[PDB]
Write the structure tokens for this entry.
Amino acid sequence: DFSITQFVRNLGLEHLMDIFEREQITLDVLVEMGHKELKEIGINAYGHRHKLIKGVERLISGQQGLNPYLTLNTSGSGTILIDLSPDDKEFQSVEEEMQSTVREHRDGGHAGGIFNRYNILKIQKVCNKKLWERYTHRRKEVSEENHNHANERMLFHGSPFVNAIIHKGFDERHAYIGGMFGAGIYFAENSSKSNQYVYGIGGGTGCPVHKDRSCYICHRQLLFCRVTLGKSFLQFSAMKMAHSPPGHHSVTGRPSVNGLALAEYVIYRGEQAYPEYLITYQIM
Amino acid sequence: DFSITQFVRNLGLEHLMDIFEREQITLDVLVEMGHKELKEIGINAYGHRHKLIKGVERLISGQQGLNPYLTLNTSGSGTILIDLSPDDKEFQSVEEEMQSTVREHRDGGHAGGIFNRYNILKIQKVCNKKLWERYTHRRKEVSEENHNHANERMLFHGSPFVNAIIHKGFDERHAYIGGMFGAGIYFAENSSKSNQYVYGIGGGTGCPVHKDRSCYICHRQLLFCRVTLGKSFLQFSAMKMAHSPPGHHSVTGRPSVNGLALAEYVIYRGEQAYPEYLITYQIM
Amino acid sequence: DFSITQFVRNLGLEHLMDIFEREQITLDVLVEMGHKELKEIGINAYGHRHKLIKGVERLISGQQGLNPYLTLNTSGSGTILIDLSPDDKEFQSVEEEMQSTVREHRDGGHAGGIFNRYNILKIQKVCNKKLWERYTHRRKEVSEENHNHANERMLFHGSPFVNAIIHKGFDERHAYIGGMFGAGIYFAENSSKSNQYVYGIGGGTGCPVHKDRSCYICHRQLLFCRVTLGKSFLQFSAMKMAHSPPGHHSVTGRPSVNGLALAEYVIYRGEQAYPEYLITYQIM
Amino acid sequence: DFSITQFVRNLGLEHLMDIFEREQITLDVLVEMGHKELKEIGINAYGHRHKLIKGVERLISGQQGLNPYLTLNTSGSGTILIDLSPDDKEFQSVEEEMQSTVREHRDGGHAGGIFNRYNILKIQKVCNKKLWERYTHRRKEVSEENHNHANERMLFHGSPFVNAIIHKGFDERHAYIGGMFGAGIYFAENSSKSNQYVYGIGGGTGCPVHKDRSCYICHRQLLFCRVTLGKSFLQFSAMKMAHSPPGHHSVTGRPSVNGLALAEYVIYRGEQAYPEYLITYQIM
Amino acid sequence: DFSITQFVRNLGLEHLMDIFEREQITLDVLVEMGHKELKEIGINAYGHRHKLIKGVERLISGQQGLNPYLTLNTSGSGTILIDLSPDDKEFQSVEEEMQSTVREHRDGGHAGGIFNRYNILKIQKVCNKKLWERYTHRRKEVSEENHNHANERMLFHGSPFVNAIIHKGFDERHAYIGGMFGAGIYFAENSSKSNQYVYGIGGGTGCPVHKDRSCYICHRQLLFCRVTLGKSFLQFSAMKMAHSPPGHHSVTGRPSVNGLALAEYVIYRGEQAYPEYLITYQIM
Amino acid sequence: DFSITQFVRNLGLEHLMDIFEREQITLDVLVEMGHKELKEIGINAYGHRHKLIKGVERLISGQQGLNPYLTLNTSGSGTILIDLSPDDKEFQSVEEEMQSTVREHRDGGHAGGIFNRYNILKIQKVCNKKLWERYTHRRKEVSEENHNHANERMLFHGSPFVNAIIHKGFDERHAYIGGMFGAGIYFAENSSKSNQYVYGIGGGTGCPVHKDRSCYICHRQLLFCRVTLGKSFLQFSAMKMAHSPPGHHSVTGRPSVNGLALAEYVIYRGEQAYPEYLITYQIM
Amino acid sequence: DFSITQFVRNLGLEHLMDIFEREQITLDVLVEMGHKELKEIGINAYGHRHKLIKGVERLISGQQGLNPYLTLNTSGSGTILIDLSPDDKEFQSVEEEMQSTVREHRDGGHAGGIFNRYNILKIQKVCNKKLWERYTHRRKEVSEENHNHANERMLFHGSPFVNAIIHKGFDERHAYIGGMFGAGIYFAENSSKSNQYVYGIGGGTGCPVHKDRSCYICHRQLLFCRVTLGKSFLQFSAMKMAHSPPGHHSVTGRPSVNGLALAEYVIYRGEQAYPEYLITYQIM
Ligand SMILES: [Zn+2]
Ligand SMILES: [Zn+2]
Ligand SMILES: [Zn+2]
Ligand SMILES: [Zn+2]
Ligand SMILES: [Zn+2]
Ligand SMILES: [Zn+2]
Ligand SMILES: [Zn+2]
């Protein structure tokens, strides 16, 4: 607690420090305190509160180019996972979405294995204010174009880097550069299609413990995410690209007899998706 | 245990967890606590309370679009049945309504059975806050039309799906599509009229245990429901409707020499009825 | 007693039920308990008491339109008769009121019997919470319309329906429609005049047992009642009012040479009287 | 005027009167002011505010039996009429109710005149707080006696005493003692039936100016009222009664081949009607 | 003036006096202040507030036998007159009570003059807490002796000493020792009878300004008072007495073939009446 | 037995009645028991105690206008007499006050007899809660006037109705209207003077047994009483006053050569005296 | 000052001193605080409060023989003078006692001065806890020795040491040994007699500044005192006694033809008097 000590000594108010130590007032707390709050903790003299408040002003606003407020407000950021109750209708909605969108796939269970259902172990709400405001800023930006319509879907995403995503967000700098539609982030309408990627491309090496791509023991993890598509460009054939086509905010690969068996969605900017629900499950 | 631990760890206040463990403070409890409540449980330093409260703010108001608050208030919802006592005047009023509205019906007791009175076993008040809020919102909306009058009646409802109704409410998506007035929810001011639908359409197969439509042994259930009729369209003949006629909120089927023997009330939106009492009885 | 179990189960607090069973906490008790009371019975964690109190709020106030608080709280209603001992000065005031207001009537005791004294067997104070509240609300109304004066009297009432009066209160819907002043409830300042109505209008058949209108053997009952007269209209001859005359709250039939031998007081609203004392007696 | 001066002089604070004169503070305003309001007007010393507040307390709470509060709170009571705009939804719904309920009557318009529709000139909402409180208190009583249902209807009322009703409310002491159902206040769901009574019983002598019962020149006034019916007694033939039948709160006369041509509703205490709208019109 | 200073200096807290001078804190204000109120005015240290509170306790309670709290707390006592509004229901009821009770008396207006009506100039409510509590204490006594019935009436009183009455209350030590029923305080239910005494016994010499008993110019004053009668002793002929008859709380003299023309009420205890309304008027 | 039975039945707690029967809990006892006392007698469940305490509240405070508390608590009231021992200093001081105040009266012992000393048989302290609280309330009233001084004396009183006094208190409605100073209660400094009135005015007929005014055999009784004099009016000549003179609370008739031989004190309100000692004695 | 620091340091709680310094907790304050007060000022730990409370117990109770509590309680003791308002009846009753008791003296107004009435400048209630407690303890003793009667009067006292008395109380160690009845403290029932001693025995030399015994300019002072007379000895001629006569508690000197013109009262213990009022006045 030395920043507060230096700040209070510079003002000639060191005799107040015994209050600040008992109330556990740090500088990041002090910068948010007005006359009312300072009067609560026991700074009874108007002159002292005036000096403290104007010092906080001269620090936070007077040196805005140094951004001292950002250095003070690191505490409290970060992700939390709120667990859903299976008795709630939100859990049952997410589970119905998982279960009802299973499809048989062209491979003999090479990537996602063989199964018709999931054993759903838990579903978690992902909360992170910084990532959330990034996503909503981009959503407002996309809907300012595209006639006030974001065109927002809920889609499945799978990859071995779920933990990194839920803390640092989606990032196009890690993009699936070899995909059918180039270097973007891929999303599926069917949960079983995303299930094929939770260990890597084409199922990867299988589960770490048993090295099996059809393991019925190890827990899997999927993300069920908000995705802003905006004006979406329809495609049927394979077409590599680094960014969206001009005037469009995403790519929709549609089912075709000689092409995609199932719908695919690709965004090329990381802040156009938010990982709202984390699902832990097993195949059966 | 996990969500509150994460929330507190992100703020740097892990040393407070043993308090939150002994006071059984979960995150849903914490989001409702201010300085006074935090002081009660032993958070004595002002800075710690300030940090907790502003973290709660950043979770609730800062991410309102994720609706974490709804994720945390799942518990406490649901229905409770408060059993009325036969010595109360409310029980006696409901039973008087049941007994005094018995009538002769055209069939020889084929659908409802042959009886003159009921043996009332119990009457229960149905309490569910979300359903009540739904009903009262629709009621305000209807009375804003129809010159500030909701035209609210208490009517009998019979169906083999009373459990679903008391736990999830009236739902027009199950509506009696083959009924005389179309796909609506039907109510009657004669208890014996509604008794004809308890085991199914036109009496069903009778009770499950005996398959008897005039069983004097097995228990039956009726609902006594608040119904907002608003502006009601008077109809004197069978008329298949999918919704209310324009300008109206419900349909009243009136008795006629060549038509209905008794009054019928049909609504086409589920939120216009609320089941206030659940009556269990036998015919005698 | 299952509503408490459902309520506690909805909150997720069923592990506390073993306490609630031992303390006999029913839901109508629980809706009256706060932090201190819940701490008394062994709910030590703050989170548990918080959840219980918030659930009680969401029930009692969140659904006030359903009036669940009145379905609970029905117990304790009803009238109790507190017995007055002959050694108390209250008993003696009431007994002296009875004895000293006896008069000789025009009839040879045909309606009430031949006597000059009573044998008072007991006097009871009638206590009924809801009837008292109804009475005091009406008295407040009358005194506001008067010049802050309720014009309250203590008057005698005789009827073969006193047992119904002390449990349900006075009721103009049973009013003496053939009375000299019409469909009102009648009171007198003489006990021997109200004694004429104990067994019926004009004496009836006398006691049920001996069928004697002057039975000196078996018991009779009068009421001594607080009557709110407000602004009283003076009358000297029969007039069959259905209600009290415009601008007035009651009627006073004054004695006349060619009219009433004794004064009478009439009210046309049951709530303006409260039956304070119940007197059991024999004539001598 | 002098009441505030006396009140302040008794406290020894007459040096403050110059403030109370400039801010137009009267005793009725002062009995509602606390420390905050007294600070606003310039009572700066804490001791002065303490003295004023304690004097107000000694007046209002200390002498509650004299009801000085009611003496001071007289101003502001009374009726206001709020005009509806013909372009409003409410005006149009009330007008639809007026027009669609016209019926042909047995007499050749002898009582009401010959017409098929109305020319509506005004519709006004009637606002009076004392009358509204009276109505809602009675409504709570009735609904508590009728399984939580008031059975509230919107009905037309016609009388040559509309002004007195809108300023004083409905009053059974003026009741139509000669009506088919005794001394009650009568309401109808047909506007024309109530229109038959605007100039008096059977139309009286017609309009004041022309003495014509079918005048098309001069305006008529109907009330549209909230009526609490509670448990309504179903009656099919005339019978004079002074109050409601036992166990009931009103009487409904049903149409019959040899009886009523149209429905009648009769209440016998005036506190269960409230005159919500005042409709001014001509017949055409 | 100096009391607060001596009290504060005795405690060794003279350095606080400046605050007490800014806030106009006198000793009679200080004795009513706790920790909260002392915090408001700026006594921030717990020790100082503790010293002040303990000093006040040692003064008010420690020397309770000296009654210092009564030497303090004399300010705010005394009467105020609240003017009634002629548009008010209370004013109209009091005026109707006064007008409707005018009677023709035996003398040709010798005492009260010749008149049929009054011009009511103003009616005032008399408010005084000391007198009110005196009266209500006596009312409780009398009701406890009269089977819980005070037998409270509103009656007229006239005398040249109205101003002394409204400030010091009714006093039997000023009683009309030569009156018809002895040394009591006399009241009437006819305003005209009271009107005979306002200028003195039999009218005295009349108005001071014109010395005319039938003056139509000068203002008269009557008191319209609550009077507790309790068990009232009826008399039909005159007899002097100093106190009530044993067992009785008042005397009511009633007309007879050789007695009063009009009713009369006499109380022998000063505190059995309260002068609630002061009426200023002229005869016409 | 029955009030408590009905009370417990209305609450639905009849199964507890057996306990109430063993512990002799009547309703008047029950209204004074809290959680502690109820837990003592074996009401172990918190819910039962809560119901009982809320019922007692709903009876005692909820119907306070009926004053049930006063009906219940009549037991225990009344006077008791406590004998003083001849060996005590209190006995000896009262006897010294008796003996030292014998004086030579003008009459040759016609009224009180011929004697110089008394034989004291017993002295009794009179204890009555109700009369004591009446006296102390009046004493406080009188000392609020008269500069905080009650002016309390101990004086003798003699009368044939001492038994009535010690049970019902002094009563000015039984006053000595024919005395030298009007209709009041008379007290003497000299016991020999009070001795003149123990058998009536002028000694009456003497002892009933022997009809002798100077009997040395029969027991007499005097009262030694507290008398609040307040501000005492000094008088030297007879004056038949009904009440105290204005501004005074007693009359002191002082000795004069042509007037009183010995001093007299007169009060005109019965609650300004209290009979502290009853002295049984013989003259010698 | 420094005692709190040593006390806290001995307990090992010196780290708490910064709280005690800020809250101004001295040792005399600390000895009165418990768990509640200590938790209010911020001693949150139970151990710290326990140690402080047991240290206080060891100091105050353990060393009770040294009376440290009396050393700490030296603060707050003293005399305060509360000014009586000239409008209150207390002031006026004291003033009328002053004025109504002026008498002519045997001498020609030599010792006191030539006057007929007084001009009162101030009346002050004297409030001193220790003196009042001494007075009441002695009063209790006297009453217990005098059949429970203290024989308390209100009497005048004149002296040139009034300030000494109001700060120290009456003291027989300064007694008027030359008085008619010995070494006592002298009180009078006439103010004009105590007026003779305001400037010393026999009037001394008059006012200090004029040396005039009848100086109409210089302020004088009297005391109006509570005097416990107990059993007062009756004497008619001078007797130089040093103490109260055996068996008595005071002396009364009676007027006589050849002796005293006015009565006097004499006590021989300073603790039987209390100077309740201090009167500042001029003669006229
Ligand atoms: Zn595996
Ligand atoms: Zn069956
Ligand atoms: Zn019989
Ligand atoms: Zn016309
Ligand atoms: Zn004149
Ligand atoms: Zn004898
Ligand atoms: Zn001088």
Observations:
- The pocket of zinc ion (ligand 6) is lined by residues F 207, 209-210, 212, 215, 217-218 (CB under 6 Å).
